[PDB]
């Protein structure tokens, strides 16, 4: 499906994460070190540039995200 550099178009952007489990945009894991990209989570639907359907892996993730509260490279909101 869509590749690592995805993520970056969206960059101070926010996109909606459409929890999946089969057939996904991008299979993610969820780290607190070393990620590809830094996601701050939010609790508002509103703004959402586009959805990109994920699923939640913990072995050979399209990327690797870390949650953070501050300075993220983009802004998600997990449905």
Do not use: H, W
């Not at 178009?9 to 991008?26: E, H, I």
């Not at 701050?40 to 072995?59: A, M």
Request: hydrophobic share 35%.
């Amino acid at each position: 499906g869509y590749g690592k550099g995805y993520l970056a178009m969206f960059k101070n952007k926010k996109v909606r994460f459409k929890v999946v489990n089969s057939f996904p945009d991008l299979k993610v894991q969820f780290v607190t070190s070393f990620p590809d990209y830094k996601v701050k989570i939010s609790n508002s639907s509103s703004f959402c540039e586009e959805t990109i359907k994920i699923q939640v892996v913990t072995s050979f993730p399209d990327v690797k995200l870390q949650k953070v509260t501050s300075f993220g490279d983009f802004e998600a909101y997990i449905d």
